[PDB]
Amino acid sequence: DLFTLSFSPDLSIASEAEQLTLQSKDDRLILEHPQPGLRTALEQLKQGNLTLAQLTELVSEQDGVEAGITFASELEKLVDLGWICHSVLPLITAIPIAKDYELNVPDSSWQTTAIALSRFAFLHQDLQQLVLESPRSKSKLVILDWRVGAVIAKLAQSDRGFIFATSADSLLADLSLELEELKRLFALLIATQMMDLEPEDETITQWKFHNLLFHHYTRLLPVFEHRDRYPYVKPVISTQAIPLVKPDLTALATTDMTLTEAIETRRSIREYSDQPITLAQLGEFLYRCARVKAVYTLPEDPMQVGESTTRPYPSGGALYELEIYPLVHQCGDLAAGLYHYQPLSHTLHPVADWTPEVESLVYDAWRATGQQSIPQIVLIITARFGRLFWKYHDIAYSLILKHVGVLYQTFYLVATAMQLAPSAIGAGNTTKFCQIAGLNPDEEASVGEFSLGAAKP
Amino acid sequence: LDLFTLSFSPDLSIASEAEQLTLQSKDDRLILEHPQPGLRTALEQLKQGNLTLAQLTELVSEQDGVEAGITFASELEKLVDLGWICHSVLPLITAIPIAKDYELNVPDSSWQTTAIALSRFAFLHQDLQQLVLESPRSKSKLVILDWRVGAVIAKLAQSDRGFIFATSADSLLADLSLELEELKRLFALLIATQMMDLEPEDETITQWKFHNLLFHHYTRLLPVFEHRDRYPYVKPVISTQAIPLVKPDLTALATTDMTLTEAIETRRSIREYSDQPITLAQLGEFLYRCARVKAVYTLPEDPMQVGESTTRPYPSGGALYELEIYPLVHQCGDLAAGLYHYQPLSHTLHPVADWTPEVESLVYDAWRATGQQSIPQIVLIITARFGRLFWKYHDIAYSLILKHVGVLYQTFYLVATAMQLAPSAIGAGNTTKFCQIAGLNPDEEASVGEFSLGAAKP
Numbered sequence: 022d023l024f025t026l027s028f029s030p031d032l033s034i035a036s037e038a039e040q041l042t043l044q045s046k047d048d049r050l051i052l053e054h055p056q057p058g059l060r061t062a063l064e065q066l067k068q069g070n071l072t073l074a075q076l077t078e079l080v081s082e083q084d085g086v087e088a089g090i091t092f093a094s095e096l097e098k099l100v101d102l103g104w105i106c107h108s109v110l111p112l113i114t115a116i117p118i119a120k121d122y123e124l125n126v127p128d129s130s131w132q133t134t135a136i137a138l139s140r141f142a143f144l145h146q147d148l149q150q151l152v153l154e155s156p157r158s159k160s161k162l163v164i165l166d167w168r169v170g171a172v173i174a175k176l177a178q179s180d181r182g183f184i185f186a187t188s189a190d191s192l193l194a195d196l197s198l199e200l201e202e203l204k205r206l207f208a209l210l211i212a213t214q215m216m217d218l219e220p221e222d223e224t225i226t227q228w229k230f231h232n233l234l235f236h237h238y239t240r241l242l243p244v245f246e247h248r249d250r251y252p253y254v255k256p257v258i259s260t261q262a263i264p265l266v267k268p269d270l271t272a273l274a275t276t277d278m279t280l281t282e283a284i285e286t287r288r289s290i291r292e293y294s295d296q297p298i299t300l301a302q303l304g305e306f307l308y309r310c311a312r313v314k315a316v317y318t319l320p321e322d323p324m325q326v327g328e329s330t331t332r333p334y335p336s337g338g339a340l341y342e343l344e345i346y347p348l349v350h351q352c353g354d355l356a357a358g359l360y361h362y363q364p365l366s367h368t369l370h371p372v373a374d375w376t377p378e379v380e381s382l383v384y385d386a387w388r389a390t391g392q393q394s395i396p397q398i399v400l401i402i403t404a405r406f407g408r409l410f411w412k413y414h415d416i417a418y419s420l421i422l423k424h425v426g427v428l429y430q431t432f433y434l435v436a437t438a439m440q441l442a443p444s445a446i447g448a449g450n451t452t453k454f455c456q457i458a459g460l461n462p463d464e465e466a467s468v469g470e471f472s473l474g475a476a477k478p
Numbered sequence: 479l480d481l482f483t484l485s486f487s488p489d490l491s492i493a494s495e496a497e498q499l500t501l502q503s504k505d506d507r508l509i510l511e512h513p514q515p516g517l518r519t520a521l522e523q524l525k526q527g528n529l530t531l532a533q534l535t536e537l538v539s540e541q542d543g544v545e546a547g548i549t550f551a552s553e554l555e556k557l558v559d560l561g562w563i564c565h566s567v568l569p570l571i572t573a574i575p576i577a578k579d580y581e582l583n584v585p586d587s588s589w590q591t592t593a594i595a596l597s598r599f600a601f602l603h604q605d606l607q608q609l610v611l612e613s614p615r616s617k618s619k620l621v622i623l624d625w626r627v628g629a630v631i632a633k634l635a636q637s638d639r640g641f642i643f644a645t646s647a648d649s650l651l652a653d654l655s656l657e658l659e660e661l662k663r664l665f666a667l668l669i670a671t672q673m674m675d676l677e678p679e680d681e682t683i684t685q686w687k688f689h690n691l692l693f694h695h696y697t698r699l700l701p702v703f704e705h706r707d708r709y710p711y712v713k714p715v716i717s718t719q720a721i722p723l724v725k726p727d728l729t730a731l732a733t734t735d736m737t738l739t740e741a742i743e744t745r746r747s748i749r750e751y752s753d754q755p756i757t758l759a760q761l762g763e764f765l766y767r768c769a770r771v772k773a774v775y776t777l778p779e780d781p782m783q784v785g786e787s788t789t790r791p792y793p794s795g796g797a798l799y800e801l802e803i804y805p806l807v808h809q810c811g812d813l814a815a816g817l818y819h820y821q822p823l824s825h826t827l828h829p830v831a832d833w834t835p836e837v838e839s840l841v842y843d844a845w846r847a848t849g850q851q852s853i854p855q856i857v858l859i860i861t862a863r864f865g866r867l868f869w870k871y872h873d874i875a876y877s878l879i880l881k882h883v884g885v886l887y888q889t890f891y892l893v894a895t896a897m898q899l900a901p902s903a904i905g906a907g908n909t910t911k912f913c914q915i916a917g918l919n920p921d922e923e924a925s926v927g928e929f930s931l932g933a934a935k936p
């Protein structure tokens with residue numbers, strides 16, 4: 022009905038003398054002894070330039086009227102699986118992106134009702150073609166004609182209320198599109214959840230564009246080709262290294278706080294004591310939190326992972342991508358500046374001295390901690406993205422954030438066990454740290470911050 | 479050559495007082511007393527926003543003097559750097575700054591004979607009541623004042639291979655009524671605002687997906703809890719039939735349980751579960767030690783009207799713990815198969831659905847995501863009631879939720895290690911399947927994490 026039906030490009034059509042297979046990635050559908058015409062209708066759906074009425078007529082020409090009605094009933098089964106694209110030629114093509122697919126041609130009242138483009142719909146270049154996408158939609162709109170882009174630009178630029186019955190004349194005057202083409206285009210836009218028939222919704226008003234997009238995309242064999250580029254430990258920044266103490270963990274396995282006691286007594290302490298946190302305390306903290314316990318290589322890894330490290334915290338598929346930069350503003354045995362921590366050698370190498378840029382970062386952390394007292398150490402957790410981006414297409418950054426949270430909890434518990442003053446940070450400036458430390462922001466950028474010091478008795 | 483219109487930023491506040499003049503922004507403010515008439519005329523025309531830098535310089539030179547004109551031309555670059563000046567090609571497009579240390583560089587004329595293409599991170603969307611082109615790699619935001627610019631961007635994105643202006647500009651000038659000079663100004667602005675790629679992207683950026691880079695750029699850059707009554711401190715009880723959970727003596731566990739160092743050094747992801755499933759008392763102790771409610775309090779002087787807030791064994795941004803735990807049980811000691819919801823204040827379990835094929839589908843998804851090791855015993859699904867946290871944090875809300883999920887993962891790992899359980903986090907799951915299972919709005923509460931728990935073999 023008022024749409025041209027085409028099979029999804031990922032669908033494979035296996036033609037046998039007495040059976041027929043339609044193969045997708047997740048599932049497949051096989052049917053035995055198909056009468057001709059049904060096979061002809063499926064072949065022309067693979068061609069994908071006919072209407073449902075035309076396909077039903079093709080079935081009826083060879084099989085009969087009852088078989089045509091049966092095929093008309095059968096087609097919605099394939100529509101539900103998301104195997105059938107709906108197009109207004111040659112203007113736009115909706116391809117499904119999710120199962121349990123449903124297309125709903127709206128009532129004619131849309132022509133006299135105020136509408137607007139969803140603020141979650143966005144136009145971008147998928148590869149070599151312009152596409153309209155939305156997290157609120159189970160469809161993906163390939164734009165075949167730039168005049169559709171002009172229509173979208175006109176109505177997004179339009180006022181809050183767009184009434185088709187009154188404003189369609191301006192569109193027919195500025196563009197060469199016919200009225201029926203425009204009505205089909207707007208109908209498909211509304212049906213693919215790209216348009217708002219209602220004025221506003223209280224549940225989605227709280228959501229931001231990037232937040233909702235990230236939530237929808239992350240919540241739904243590769244090879245590490247750049248393994249030589251991204252090693253397990255980051256190459257040494259500066260060879261001048263300050264050693265850190267290594268505590269005997271066997272004695273601390275009995276001297277330290279009980280896990281239950283540490284969990285029940287942990288609190289965020291932002292008022293630091295007068296005696297700053299010592300370098301030995303920082304060394305013990307880093308050794309108990311983010312050290313390298315052992316370096317291993319899987320005996321049979323098809324992904325060419327090579328060497329991977331084990332650390333006190335977990336990470337998705339190993340591939341520990343977190344570096345710790347202990348920016349020191351006030352330490353007992355160290356001068357002010359930004360440093361970098363190496364987990365395998367248990368050393369810290371300086372990155373920058375006490376420049377007003379490092380001071381800007383310190384001031385940001387101090388304001389984010391509530392301006393209770395002057396920070397002593399600020400650990401900045403940075404993510405070398407090339408470590409795991411190859412293995413996870415969409416779920417990479419959420420995994421990185423969850424690892425940052427794990428590291429936050431470990432920091433909290435260890436600092437509570439060491440009578441320190443821990444406090445996580447909500448967010449920071451990634452470009453400022455990219456400038457201070459000289460990093461490739463598309464290859465390694467800061468993703469977390471934590472404030473650490475000494476707590477008064 | 480200078481070919482852009484300078485306007486005052488809409489985000490900037492102009493304080494016009496007697497004998498003084500103030501330009502107020504969020505990060506910085508610039509005040510100046512005794513302003514000369516030429517500077518005043520230039521600032522007024524910048525408020526108008528219809529002159530180029532050369533025109534403003536000439537006006538300042540005619541009103542205050544030539545040296546004063548040069549001084550104003552030097553001074554205006556500092557205001558441009560702070561992101562206070564928008565650059566527009568009227569009436570086609572206006573670039574507004576969105577980041578400090580702002581800089582606009584008119585590209586060399588060679589761009590007309592060089593192949594270019596639209597950045598795949600540039601996206602058009604409707605913001606407020608106007609069309610806007612944005613990009614995480616750009617320091618600017620383009621307000622599209624004319625739909626013909628949208629048609630140009632559509633033709634450019636639709637165009638295949640490389641687009642060379644010198645060869646293909648004739649088709650754009652013939653299909654649309656835009657003038658050649660207007661088209662060159664538009665393309666110059668697009669190239670200068672990092673919206674166009676003259677090089678084949680880069681190997682480091684190819685690793686990045688659109689949504690990941692957008693989220694990373696937006697998150698890593700007093701409100702009032704108006705809807706507090708809709709999103710309370712504990713979620714309202716789903717079903718009145720409630721199963722109680724065992725409360726362990728935490729004063730005794732404060733000395734009997736293993737040390738924190740022992741738990742951190744012994745912890746590991748265990749996926750091979752025992753033949754004897756995890757009991758209900760173990761699940762109760764686990765939930766009581768991980769995500770129970772310890773106390774309900776109210777801030778003595780809270781201007782945000784936060785109201786009631788709870789304390790819990792794990793930390794969370796600004797308190798207001800918005801995470802709920804649904805323990806989907808496939809095989810437990812004294813609990814039938816089905817989905818449940820954990821109430822931490824009463825320390826209870828309330829059923830949500832029985833062993834339906836969709837609960838089994840969730841179990842199958844978790845089992846495949848955990849490597850198909852034995853059979854899963856309990857799967858905790860961590861969900862986030864967004865309305866409790868979204869009011870306070872606009873952009874960093876979801877990142878805070880993910881970090882909270884990570885904190886809860888680490889707490890689960892440590893407590894399960896201390897209790898000789900079999901913990902294992904899960905990378906991702908199906909949020910819409912869980913939304914279909916439990917009658918919840920996915921825009922108000924949706925699954926954001928998964929964890930698998932069972933018993934470890936001796």
Ligand SMILES: Cc1cc2nc3c(=O)[nH]c(=O)nc-3n(C[C@H](O)[C@H](O)[C@H](O)COP(=O)(O)O)c2cc1C
Nearest residue numbers: 288289389390445446447793794795796797878881
């Ligand atoms: C992800 C995350 C970010 C946080 N960011 C901040 C912050 O920016 N400033 C701050 O004072 N506390 C921050 N905190 C700590 C919380 O404010 C703290 O958990 C809460 O205010 C008090 O909980 P407590 O019992 O640990 O003291 C953060 C905690 C987490 C988990």
Ligand SMILES: Cc1cc2nc3c(=O)[nH]c(=O)nc-3n(C[C@H](O)[C@H](O)[C@H](O)COP(=O)(O)O)c2cc1C
Nearest residue numbers: 335336337338339423746747847848849903904905
């Ligand atoms: C955020 C996150 C997600 C994870 N997702 C999975 C998963 O989906 N499947 C799985 O088997 N393990 C998962 N894990 C556990 C890791 O695979 C595990 O840490 C690693 O493979 C082995 O480390 P460990 O045995 O020392 O704990 C996840 C861990 C984290 C932190």
